[PDB]
Amino acid sequence: QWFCNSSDAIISYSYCDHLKFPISISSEPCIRLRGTNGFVHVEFIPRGNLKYLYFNLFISVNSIELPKRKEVLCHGHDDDYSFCRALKGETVNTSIPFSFEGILFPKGHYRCVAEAIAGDTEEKLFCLNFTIIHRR
């Protein structure tokens, strides 16, 4: 249950219950529910070639779960991100700049799972159960 806490939001993460391959992932600053430009530090060893990497996001505002969302970070050709060239077994140390614009009037209990998927082979790379809570 790896957590920091901003003074308006407490962020904690953990592995998914049936997928627990390793990652050290971390944000600076610790995210505010309203606006945080900064970096996400990632350390792990990809179980598969990170070219064609993408995510499957299942989010839940106040325990009301949303539809699936599919973010691609690596299209496999001249990719924005350096870690897209990474290979199965090689180490990945990279802080990515992330920019959260916010939500003016944010609410309660958010909750996000994230499946990194190697698009080449559709195999599972890792899975992260997040949590974000407001105020007291």
Partner: protein, 593 residues
């Protein structure tokens, strides 16, 4: 032990906490992934018995020691992968044994230089990947001479700071050598005066190297004297990243000759940089992930033959008038832009897919200004208003509107003028066909993909009568209940016919009589309860048929024919057709004589 993804060929021994190699494994195998197992050492003869292996992967296998003659038995291996083993040093003849190797990956193997690297023995080697290592030098070794087939070396995420004359000296000896180099993620600061004199490279890749502009700028100046087929230049959002990026840094590029320039993600950006004059005589400009917002200031003397823009941020469509542009690609924009006319007499290939492109007045000569367009892809965009029947574009042979909102297409014969066209995709365009005359004009057409659409009264109507040459027709997912009388009489050359995922309530034998040439017929997931006797009897050339997911009434004698036909023809049925109620296979039912 391992997973048998493919019986006696491919295995998946990944993360099996395997102390050693396993012995109970077949010898026939052409592939095995052994990654993530604690192998620690690599034994002499550790794979000597196995000897038909093309792909062997030992990524992250904790390896510290490659004993002489370890691979000894693997004379058909083309790909060996060693990513992420702490094999600090490789003994002379550490490999010698591998005769047919084409791809060596030694990424993150704690390697210090190429010179010691015992690979001069490998004649058939094509790619060498040694990125993510401790190399501090770009010196192309002398042993390259021996390596006739090697064309890609990857020196990424290393510690190289300088490229000297002597470093690349091997290449002045060898102008009859094809080679590409990836030098990305190296903190290069100093590239030596006249260090790139008299040398050819195929592609040079320099991204996320340079920290400052005057470092970058100086470095690009001493690139002088170079022929690259393809120059890739940029940085990554997760890196050493430039304070400022001006076109003035492109200076120096005017000395280097370039065939294919390729810019990628850059933090700071101004449009003018692609308009920059040293990029004028390039034979193929290209942009990926680029913050560019407009593109018009484009001198007509620029000799570019293909322009590509991929995942850029254009705010308004290019107005372009390059006389020599033969192939334009503008795909995956961020802005949901709208099409504006162009003038490109050389243009023969146009991919504008996957933007949210709108397009009032499609389409005719005036729109582009060419008589030689052969490939036009408008897929995955938005509102495309059909206002003109392709008059003046009769050379078109490939046309794609997948997932785009075609409008007015049911009002008139919008493809009338496309006498030569061969492939047409209007699937998921949400077209509800009102109009028998929708496909007039299309006499050469071979492939018609139109799944996801719909038909007035849900009735398949007589739209195919002037499309005799159709050999592929996909009408799946079209909410069809019925087929009108005439509708397939003309389709004598058709091989594949898809009508799965519809709501067909019945068949008429008369719809298949003249499909003389039909290899594949899919009628699966419909509402068919039964089939006219003998319906499939004259489909001479049929190889596959799908009939499952339909509530077949299996009462005898009604099910007599179909049940017998399947049992006579099982090799051809794909999937398994079942009786409603019981769920029993249809091939299995027998009737009382």
């Amino acid at each position: 032990p391992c997973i048998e993804v493919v019986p006696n060929i491919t295995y998946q021994c990944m993360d099996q906490k395997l102390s050693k190699v396993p012995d109970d494994i077949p010898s026939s195998t052409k592939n095995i992934d052994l990654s993530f197992n604690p192998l620690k050492i690599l034994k002499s003869y550790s794979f000597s018995n196995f000897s038909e292996l093309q792909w062997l992967d030992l990524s992250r296998c904790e390896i510290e020691t490659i004993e002489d003659k370890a691979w000894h038995g693997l004379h058909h291996l083309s790909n060996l992968i060693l990513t992420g083993n702490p094999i600090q040093s490789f003994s002379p003849g550490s490999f010698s044994g591998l005769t047919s190797l084409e791809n060596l990956v030694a990424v993150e193997t704690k390697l210090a230089s190429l010179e010691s690297f015992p690979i001069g023995q490998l004649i058939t080697l094509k790619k060498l990947n040694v990125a993510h290592n401790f190399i501090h030098s770009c010196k192309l070794p002398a042993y390259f001479s021996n390596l006739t087939n090697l064309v890609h070396v990857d020196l990424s995420y290393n510690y190289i700071q300088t490229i000297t004359v002597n470093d690349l000296q091997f290449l002045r000896e060898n102008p009859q050598v094809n080679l590409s180099l990836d030098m990305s993620l190296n903190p290069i600061d100093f590239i030596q005066d006249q260090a790139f004199q008299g040398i050819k490279l195929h592609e040079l890749t320099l991204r996320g190297n340079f920290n400052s502009s005057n470092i970058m700028k100086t470095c690009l100046q001493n690139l002088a004297g170079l022929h690259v087929h393809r120059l890739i230049l940029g940085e990554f959002k997760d890196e050493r990243n430039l304070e400022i990026f001006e076109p003035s840094i492109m200076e120096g590029l005017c000395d280097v000759t370039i065939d294919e320039f390729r810019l990628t993600y850059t933090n700071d950006f101004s449009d003018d940089i692609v308009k920059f004059h040293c990029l004028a005589n390039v034979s193929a400009m290209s942009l990926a992930g680029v913050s560019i917002k407009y593109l018009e200031d484009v001198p007509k003397h620029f000799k570019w033959q293909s322009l590509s823009i991929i995942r850029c941020q254009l705010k308004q469509f290019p107005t372009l008038d390059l006389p020599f542009l033969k192939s334009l690609t503008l795909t995956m924009n961020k802005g949901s832009i709208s099409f504006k006319k162009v003038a490109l007499p050389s243009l023969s290939y146009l991919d504008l897919s996957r933007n949210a492109l709108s397009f009032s007045g499609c389409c005719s000569y005036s729109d582009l200004g060419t008589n030689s367009l052969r490939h036009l892809d408008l897929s995955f965009n938005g509102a495309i208003i059909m206002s003109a029947n392709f008059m003046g574009l009769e050379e078109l042979q490939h046309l794609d509107f997948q997932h785009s909102t075609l409008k007015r297409v049911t009002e008139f014969s919008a493809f009338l003028s496309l006498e030569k066209l061969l492939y047409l995709d209007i699937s998921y365009t949400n077209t509800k066909i009102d109009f028998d005359g929708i496909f007039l004009g299309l006499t050469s057409l071979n492939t018609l993909k139109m799944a996801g659409n719909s038909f007035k009264d849900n009735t398949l109507s007589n739209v195919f009568a002037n499309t005799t040459n159709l050999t592929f027709l996909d009408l799946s997912k079209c909410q069809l209940e019925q087929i009108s009388w005439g509708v397939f009489d003309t389709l004598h050359r058709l091989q594949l016919l898809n009508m799965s995922h519809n709501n067909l309530l019945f068949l008429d034998s008369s719809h298949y009589n003249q499909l003389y040439s039909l290899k594949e017929l899919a009628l699966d997931t419909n509402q068919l309860k039964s089939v006219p006797d003998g319906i499939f009897d004259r489909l001479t050339s049929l190889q596959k048929i799908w009939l499952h997911t339909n509530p077949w009434d299996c009462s005898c004698p009604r099910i007599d024919y179909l049940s017998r036909w399947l049992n006579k023809n099982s090799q051809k049925e794909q999937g398994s057709a079942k009786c409603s109620g019981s769920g029993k296979p249809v091939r299995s039912i027998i009737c009382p004589t």
